[PDB]
Amino acid sequence: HWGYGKHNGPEHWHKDFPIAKGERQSPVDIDTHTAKYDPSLKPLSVSYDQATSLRILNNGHAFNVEFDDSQDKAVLKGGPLDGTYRLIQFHFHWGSLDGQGSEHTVDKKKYAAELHLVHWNTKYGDFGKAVQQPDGLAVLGIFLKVGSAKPGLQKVVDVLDSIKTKGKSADFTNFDPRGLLPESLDYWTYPGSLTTPPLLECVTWIVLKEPISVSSEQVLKFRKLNFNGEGEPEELMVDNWRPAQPLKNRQIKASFK
């Protein structure tokens, strides 16, 4: 039922999912001036050398590139995190125009898109149990701006026509998510939630300061995807972002400056 339209978009989600008005909802605006530099924060450890991508799926809201998370192969640690978080999937949120599309904002700035690399805490055994825990997930968020192409993105862009509509999937092996990372791993971090229903308050958000650039042609291909299934009226998959939510009783920490 939920989606991103006038009638079922973010401002409606609270009726099915009451925590949408909770105390640690995401995304948020990152006020860079009031983010607290924490010299005790560690460098993020991104260990994606042995990542095994499996498949790409249009789930009707976005597309997910899924990984084999049945061993410690692509893991996130360090940073604000205790213990080890395994990559399960990544996906993006993007706009109908270059001036919008990110979920997090930085001093109210919206990026064209935002990449979420979703990881679950191995102490909880699997993703489904992890999302019921307050430290269950760690999502690495990376902003996308439009400029020069991201060559490491092109494999993803080129398979989108094979997953145009809801429920379509395609094999997607040997994709290296290191090609989606900017040079710096400087980040902001704060406790929050899934940005999509069920909006569970289980995420440590780690948002990189440095965006990656992607070309106008790459983001255009995102915008040709469909939220509908095959054989249904075409509604372009665009503006699949949730706006900034109240920060409430939270502090955003900076690993830099």
- Which entry of ligand E27, Zn ion, none binds 203, CB below 5 to 8 A by partner kind? ligand E27
The nearest distance, CB 94 to Zn ion, in angstroms, is 11
Alpha carbon distance 163, 123 (integer Å): 33
Closest to ligand E27 by CB, 33 or 94? 94
CA 186 to chain centre: 17
Whether residue 61 lies in the annotated active site: yes
- The first and second tokens of residue 94, run together, are 């993007």
Contact status, residue 61 vs residue 196, Cβ threshold 8 Å = yes
Alpha carbon distance 42, 115 (integer Å): 22
93 is in an annotated binding site: yes
Contact call for residue 113 and ligand E27 (CB under 6 A): no
- Which entry of ligand E27, Zn ion, none binds 118, CB below 5 to 8 A by partner kind? ligand E27
116 is in an annotated binding site: yes
Binding mask 67-106 toward ligand E27 (x if CB under 6 A, else -) reads: ----------------------------------------
Contact call for residue 119 and Zn ion (CB under 5 A): no
- Which entry of ligand E27, Zn ion, none binds 194, CB below 5 to 8 A by partner kind? ligand E27
The nearest distance, CB 236 to Zn ion, in angstroms, is 18
**What's the N-to-C CA distance of the chain in angstroms?**
43
Rg (CA), the chain: 17
DSSP β-ladder status, 212-214 and 29-30: unpaired
User: CA nearest 153: which of 96, 213, 89?
Assistant: 213
Please identify the residue of the shown chain whose CB is closest to the bound Zn ion: 116
- The first and second tokens of residue 63, run together, are 């597309």
Which amino acid, one-letter code, is at 64?
N
Binding mask 177-216 toward ligand E27 (x if CB under 6 A, else -) reads: -----------------xxx-x----x-------------
- DSSP labels for 192-221? E--SSTT--S-EEEEEESSPEEE-HHHHHH
Contact call for residue 116 and Zn ion (CB under 5 A): yes
Q: Return the ∠ at Cα 177 (arms to 175 and 180), rounded to 5°.
A: 125
Pick out residues in 121-140 that bind ligand E27 (CB under 6 A): 131, 137, 139
Known binding-site residue numbers for substrate:
195-196
Active-site residue set: 61
Binding region for ligand E27 (CB under 6 A): 59, 61, 64, 116, 118, 131, 137, 139, 194-196, 198, 203
